[PDB]
Write a protein that binds this ligand. Structure first.
Ligand SMILES: O=C(O)CCCC[C@H]1[C@H]2NC(=O)N[C@H]2C[S@@]1=O
Ligand SMILES: O=C(O)CCCC[C@H]1[C@H]2NC(=O)N[C@H]2C[S@@]1=O
Ligand SMILES: O=C(O)CCCC[C@H]1[C@H]2NC(=O)N[C@H]2C[S@@]1=O
Ligand SMILES: O=C(O)CCCC[C@H]1[C@H]2NC(=O)N[C@H]2C[S@@]1=O
Lengths: 121, 122, 122, 121
């Protein structure tokens, strides 16, 4: 899917390189400008490969576990959102960042936020 | 013992997953509710070297709700942690985004929480 | 029977509330966890004329975590529904925002879920 | 609290009129540009009345139950966020909109989003 496939940046300055496969797969790498992260992390996700054509966005999501060969934050983020195509393509998301915690600290395990991605073009 | 296996949440949904050695999650999801029938592909990631202090194992995965039977034009992500032991559990929060027009984007995303165990419902 | 009363969540926190006839919630909250001691003021709102089809009663409330003992420079909102019957329940999701610099705003907000009943813990 | 007290608008065109009391109270009215809503609804909430002075925002939250003398959507929204003062004051929030549902439909009871409010000045 040519629309989604490419390089994207968000408002924090983070980098999202993704390829959208014909089967609904998302694969790529993520580099965060913030947090307990350095270098590229694997991402995987899914997207609606046959979206509505009535002006609606294309639903998608992906996950990064924050372990690579250089860093392990013991955490994972999922982004859930929609791709909005056109000449000024955007991916608008909300996300959940869960850190591994003890059971007593589980109440404070999950951060929530929102990222807007702009396609480099 | 481990993430790999067949899990069920409080709604009776079935989450079948394999955890690869280096952090991949791959499997299928069947929801007991919503605009869904049969199994859907899921992929995700988990921390393949968790802390050794009693902490849970962070993980997440995604389902896009399109298969041979239906297309809900939506996707859910689950973010959470696996907690091992005698009754292993995955505790999650989730975000279900539907494709919308820009005008309706404000009402595009449902949020909830699912807890999974390996105990089959009756 | 009703929203008015003393409630306890799964953490052992104590939520004491009065539901006014026209939709006000007023009371106190004591958290079993976090940067908190003793009771904090809370205020909120509820649907004072719910649907008559078996649906729950929508409600929400806020605590700012400042009292005579501490100030965590944070606030939590709970959004959910009251479900009456033999074991009345309030099921919520919550957002805990801490005051941060603009640079740290990305990590300002925790999310979770609390379920309340009138059963005192032991 | 002069900072928070005033009229605010968000990116949807909704209107938030609030008064911040010395005791940490927020009181006012909300008018939504969208959804099952018409006219003004009561809001109540709380804010940190003695915030940090190290450059941090002021934590706050409020609730609207979507019943007034003209409309009842059988729902309630809470906004949780922070006030960022200065000449271009903002209230940056995330929100949870819970609708009353049957028990079988409770899984789909709650919407999540984010609103940014600008002070009318
Ligand atoms: O601190 C960690 O646990 C790992 C890094 C998390 C970075 C977060 C931050 N970076 C970003 O591009 N968007 C937000 C949501 S991602 O969880
Ligand atoms: O209706 C749809 O858009 C597709 C099905 C969504 C089912 C949801 C529901 N099922 C489940 O096991 N947990 C929750 C979160 S999943 O988004
Ligand atoms: O640490 C703080 O900032 C203040 C205390 C927060 C306690 C939280 C925790 N306690 C509870 O009963 N439910 C959850 C959500 S409330 O934000
Ligand atoms: O549809 C309803 O149930 C009542 C109206 C909800 C309006 C929502 C929408 N309007 C707004 O200014 N911000 C968002 C979050 S508020 O729940």
């Amino acid at each position: 899917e040519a629309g989604i496939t490419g390089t994207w940046y968000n408002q924090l300055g983070s980098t999202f390189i993704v390829t959208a496969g014909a089967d609904g797969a998302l694969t790529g790498t993520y580099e965060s400008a913030v947090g307990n992260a350095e270098s590229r992390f694997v991402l995987t996700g899914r997207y609606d490969s046959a979206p509505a054509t009535d002006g609606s966005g294309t639903a998608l999501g992906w996950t990064v576990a924050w372990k690579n060969n250089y860093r392990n934050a013991h955490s994972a983020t999922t982004w859930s959102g929609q791709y909005v195509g056109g000449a000024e393509a955007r991916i608008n998301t909300q996300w959940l960042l869960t850190s591994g915690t003890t059971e007593a600290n589980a109440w404070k395990s999950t951060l929530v936020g929102h990222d807007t991605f702009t396609k480099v073009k």
